[model samples]
Target: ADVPAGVQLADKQTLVRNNGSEVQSLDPHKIEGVPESNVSRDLFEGLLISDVEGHPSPGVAEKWENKDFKVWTFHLRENAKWSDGTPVTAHDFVYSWQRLADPNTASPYASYLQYGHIANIDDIIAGKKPATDLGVKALDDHTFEVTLSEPVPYFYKLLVHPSVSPVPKSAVEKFGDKWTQPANIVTNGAYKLKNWVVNERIVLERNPQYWDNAKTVINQVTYLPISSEVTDVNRYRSGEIDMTYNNMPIELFQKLKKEIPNEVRVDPYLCTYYYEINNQKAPFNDVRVRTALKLALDRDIIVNKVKNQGDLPAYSYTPPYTDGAKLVEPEWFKWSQQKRNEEAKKLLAEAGFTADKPLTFDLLYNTSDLHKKLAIAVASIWKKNLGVNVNLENQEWKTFLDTRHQGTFDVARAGWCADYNEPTSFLNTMLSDSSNNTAHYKSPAFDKLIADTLKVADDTQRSELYAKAEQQLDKDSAIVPVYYYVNARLVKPWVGGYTGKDPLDNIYVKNLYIIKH
Candidate 1:
């Protein structure tokens, strides 16, 4: 059942139970941001999709096998079809991979393919050779093959992401530069984009061509990008919207909890929000200076005053609840306040700063009210504890990201929400020399630890190696861990089928049928 366009010219879309939410433009190649990636995940069908248990389930591909573990073959589901009534074929996948790896495309998540057994993809994206020269190949219309650099246990899970989804060759060839716009965008999933007005709302219509449209319960779904907490709460209360995420304010949550306890939901997210000191810059270049800055602030105060709720304070990079992985606490967590203050003093003194010669540095943060509060709290702690004059600098989201990427700030706040359940998903990419490594913090030992772990044959041995790598990351203070995020959303009692998934809030609309009594 597709969502018909209303009198207001608005189209309805489905939301599957426990399935991920859709965010931005559906062009799989260009969904670099988290919001955009979430949207792309729902609107586009990949080779696989993660199940409720966090394991891979066949998506576009009905089944796959590897005769020699190195050479893998995928058999496409014959029922899958593009929005334009054409059968989705292996050629579409080939073109998509080539386009994503193309230097002209400049995709930030291109490096993701290189992890696991797809290491050759990194070389291809780096312009060392053409993407065709890499391992993947189309056997025929419905069959595709890939040669891995090494064995990847989590290979199937990685395939569930949009980074590996098939692209319509006709759409790219016909539309060229205008391919991702609403008119030109072709979808091969359960829903199709009806409209996308930046910062306003994005609407999706059910795709008649979708193989599983019969089970896609909701007729139409809409996503409104409301950044304000009060506005989002009001919309949810008035039945104007289904739910609100991330932007919920503390005041609203307190009010809602008192009024309707069932409306407020809180679940742990595998994300770490932390401050990074540019290792390439003057004062931060010294490990002691870095240690001093970290020691000056109290994480508890920041969490209570700024974030509120039961958001757990982080002492290490590895967030708890990753399957089969142990969370090892860092040395910094064990240090007493007296010891921390003394250590800060010692480090600054070692870095050539004294009582008469206080160190001065600027702290950079986004324009969010919460971030401003956190920054001021941290700055005050530094001034009181270490006699350091910390200046605060605030910028809008886009401007802040641009400046952070360019390494313009001395100390900047950043966060990494887990893309997948694996620890490597967070650690290896951030510390590696890849594009996501904005901290400019690099270590050969850390890189080798990650690379070596991925190469191990035994599962037990591999997990051990990964844990070792994380231990090294914690020891290095590669990035200060402030707190692990909690996924808090407001849901109406009428919305019965939604379920919590790891990493973030993913709305699966296909299984959500309206149960009107």
Candidate 2:
């Protein structure tokens, strides 16, 4: 479908966009979804925030310095203020940081606090100490200090996450869990929530109390929870929206390359699209069953033939050489497509499933073109090569997340975006005690390797350890590796300060402004 004539700004200088999915929670400490993080940034600024190109910059903290290799001191901006006219203080950040580690709070992200960066974490995370005894401290109203157990180069990267974003203690205690609601919310970022309609849209008004409010253009932004690719692109075509986070359809996006080339934006994202097989479930518990399914699917076809977007066939959970190990390649990576399928049939037969009695299992994926296409392609291959029948089911994103967490499905759909730009972001999920480990595939050897990697400060040495751990996952067929991601975006010509970013899952609402002739 072609765009309607006179399709232009629906409302000038006001950037309207989509959330790609519904937000589970607006509270910084409780947010788990990736889209939640993006919206959280708009309502609550963090200690450090990223620029348009995903580079770190001072936000609440004016400047920070390393007080040794293991300790850090951050100086807060006195000028920064919350939506309610209260100053954004060091104590605000301290309270928020500790709350994440609070045993009573029961944050799923509490494992983040146990990563040896903060002080007294061993006892704090073990429930032996209170959240008040955790690492961060407010030396003064404006000075915040943190003590790390060891030197961490990616420490600033963690500071930008919503889990570390400041939460007003007064508001939390007063409003309790309802503090995230628009009527009770107090934000310190460039925007403040004006309206929130569940399963609909959220409207944000610029915060006059913000430190650099003068620099914050685009007076209002409306974030819709619309994520369907076809509907999103159609909305864009009719000029109902100005910007959208990667929700455009691939078939339509390709046509836009010729029809409206300037509208298409694609960049490498540090994410892997794979499904977790519930090892606790029967049949799938057998290694032969898992391996047969993995080998039968031709990832190359899924990337090229089925979906024409920028995607790479992933053989490993981590994309090739992502964390300084680009040089490492195993023989299986060099094997031909034909050879893999040949072995796939043998594995299926060995698992006691013959052509007469084919192996059958459910394949679940979230409702999206990306997931549907890949699931269909892979299902077809299983029928062709392994004599397996797949029952494909699609659910909405949030419901799908909960279903996977509960291990209710035979094989559930899943994806991972790097929490930080390190191999640990990819490898640590395989740890036996990892909070995000949905597959329940535990291996003592894999756990030891991950622990050793965390202890190693040297980059090259850590990368070597990561390779070994990844080999264990591959050998066990811990998770099916489907494809590596590349984000496709669409920005209107009038949207200023928008650019493609490196492999990070972030959005820059503060840096953007509107430009018109």
Candidate 3:
């Protein structure tokens, strides 16, 4: 049955979801966090969009093809137009992609296209070449072409990220950083920015100019930037919002699941929660100390007891579901908790720490009750098993991000969600030259394995290289894998088409319809 017309303006045809914390930026190229990305995804359509099942679905490009996964071509939908009624063309994509790779853009995900092995992208990001030297070209007003340095079988999946979305080059050039302001923004997605109030809410209205506007049932969407998980749930219960952010107070998970079994969702999300150890800092600079800390962590307790939301205990950085890659777990993972603790003591002792002198370091995390609990639990475990002195600290989201990026923290709470469903999505972050490598972990062997893996066209051989790289990560122990994530959120019964099935958990309001309660 087709959706009936005249859905209520502020109720039936509207979606109000919890978007945690103030957005860092609305500019697609500048967005770095989950909240910002969520809004950016609604305001900008990438060449490919993630479907309900997490597969690449059509966006600006109607159809695309590749030869040997190296050279790719795309055909833009002629009907696609920006919110201001400007026709969307291949040249927009070419300019947008070049801007992402441009050194001046300073996008945190600058290496994003590099993962696709985009030709000259590495040189462009390194400032050895101009942005105009990028390998993307517009053959015609509608035909876009891309040439990669090597075959990338997973290149299509990479296109679904908001970082690769096309931008209005004219607006950016004219308004600079203010280009993303609601008044200045001209988007091409199903929704366009209507209003933005910092620390309060961001609103979007249905874009009539959207290429597929006829299929979009939702008329308006609102994102409330609520940082507290408990408050997010409270608002959901009070009918103030329809959905929650990816977390609901961890302690209340069981109770919420029991009370609202149909509404409470805890699905297997493709992310890994870990503690990022600064390898360049003192005490942690030694592999023995790093290995000891990694071995001492009781992942079972962390996942099952502390964060009991059906999250799996992670033994490797890359989650098990990553396509075509076999993860390699450390040998210590086979040992019992007691056995692991004993080995940890020996490693710490060998690192020159004694009963009189204990290794001390601060564990930094973002300001959240869940994060604080996790830090306290981990710190407790370290003290009990290794007699280590661990200081705990919390900062706001934006401040925590800068602290970690600047390598000012000894240990920091970190979770990485897949930008794409490939092993490299996780492994690439550990590369020596990767901007995302907050730990400053460097290993020539690991770098070589990733470099070799990128060029291999055979899936079986590629899997082997991926396994070797994971093994290298395990041996280094520069980061401690705690658990695989389960995106826990609540959705109202009236919200139809809220599948929440995508491992990436990308919500597209265009595919969602509201049912009268």
Candidate 4:
């Protein structure tokens, strides 16, 4: 098909640019803690959807009705089709839910699904009851219903997540041992994956059998994984890639900002970069040692000197301006530096420490230049302010993870980008019971606060409970808050209609279009 002048025909294939970064796997059921999980979103459909504003809208299940905030009835769309041309049914959703909740699956996000609308899901995963006893059930081919333990204000939002996406029962049954492998992948959304070469590149072609294929704007998209900042910048400069994200170095950033202002952009992402003291370990088990370690750091210096690109210093776990809320400091941040220092001194003194008797601890960080610089700054602050000699150590990501998971470090630096907009995404992961909690900080009162919040039907009460939990976290000082992170990326001028808005700054090719090249 040829296009006339001034009548630009939409290309059947769209090229998505990536830095060739590695993705662990494509199994949405097990996908956790990576930006690449979003690439799977195009191939899977959830009960609900997110609108342009990133709020929950409707997806496969067109509409839903709740009876007394317990029983939820969902109406499925009729024309939905899998990549193999089979009609997508509510039973698929049921199977998917069962698979995710199965204890043997050992999904890292299992705890997240257990709160609020999905409470008691943990029991199901624990094998205390059959899958049928779980809340969700498919009434017919098109109708799905859910019974929640309590009313959830964000129930719809939860549905939009990849964890709730439907998977075909036949694919799982037929493939058996090979399900989720590249050859066995089945998709019900706008696109179906073709080739995924581990740390290389992934290619997706339009799923013509998709229910909304006509509405799908892109035909083909590709993701390449490049982990190095220098390589990413070089590729962008050579026009070999379309976008490069958070890994850019400060020196290169300065050049890009000055030489190509339009290409560089920064946004206050809902991410916090902080240091966690392994409370389960020996020295960190002392509250005064933890407090002394925190007082040792000059956060402002690290943010300005090390991060260098307007990254905001944080005194609390919650980043400002998260979930459309205005950026405001927590109540605790209002305390004067003198007051905070006095408190720190009191805690340290209680544990028997002074200028004459300096404490010693080891600090660890990822072996990146920025991280190394930041670690040095923190160590210097500890030496100067608290008269503590903090030994700095740097390790590769894999080694760092292995050590952190085993609770091997006295103090270690870690950062968490939001999983979603929810506050729990940031706070809940650090619970002692959570698989993601490497720090081993536990409190029955903290757990009770989280549990009570989920059981409450009222939004106001739930929020209050969360706030109380957050305050408790601050008081415990299990993790010394350093600074919230902002992602700075380079976007080419030709790329238009792209919303680089996700907290992870994920790039979506669906609405992306090139200007007249």
Top candidate (lDDT): 3
Please report, in order, the local distance difference test score of every candidate based on alpha carbons.
Answer: 0.71, 0.78, 0.87, 0.71
Q: In model 4, where is the ten-residue run with the lowest total lDDT? A: 1-10
Q: For model 1, how does the per-residue alpha-carbon lDDT over 1-517 read when each residue is reduced to its tens digit?
A: 2333331211333332211123434578765555666567657887877654445778889999876456678899888898888888888887887777777877666776676455377778778887777677889988988778877766666687677787888878899868878899888887788887766677778889998888676666677755455666777787677666564565566777769888787777777778977778887777788877777677877787666877888776667666557766666678777787888889889889987888998989865545676777778877889999988998755567668778998988877776667777777675556766778888888888778875677778877877787777666556677888787777766555556654544444564545431
Judged by whole-model lDDT over C-alpha atoms, candidate 3 comes out at 0.87
Off by over 4 Å in 1: 1-26, 67-69, 304-306, 354-357, 501-504
- lDDT of candidate 4 over 234-315, digit per residue (tens): 7887887766646666557777787899888787677888898898787678877786666656676777766688888787
Ranking by lDDT: 3, 2, 1, 4
Q: Over the stretch 1-517, how does candidate 3's per-residue lDDT look in tens digits?
A: 1344665323558889898888878888877777778888888997899887878888889999999888999988889899999999999999999999988888888888877889998889888999999999999999999999888877888898899999998899999989988879999999999999988889999999998888888888999988888888888988899989886677677787878898987787888899999999988999999998998999888888888888898888899887776876667998899999999999999999967898998999987768888899999999998999999998888888878878899999998998888889889889888877888898999999999986776889999999988888888897998988888889888887767778888878787888766
RMSD to the true structure for each prediction, in A, is: 4.4, 4.0, 2.0, 3.8
Residue pairs clashing, model 2: 321-326
Ranking by TM-score: 3, 2, 1, 4
User: Candidate 4: which pairs clash?
Assistant: 19-225, 19-226, 20-224, 20-225, 20-226, 21-225, 21-226
Per-residue accuracy of model 2 over 309-369 as CA lDDT, tens digit each: 8788887887764656543555666789889888888887887899989888888888887
Stretches of candidate 2 off by over 4 Å are: 1-11, 120-123, 321-323
Residue 349, candidate 1: C-alpha displacement in angstroms? 2.4
Each prediction's total of clashing residue pairs, residues at least 3 apart in sequence or on different chains, is 13, 1, 0, 7
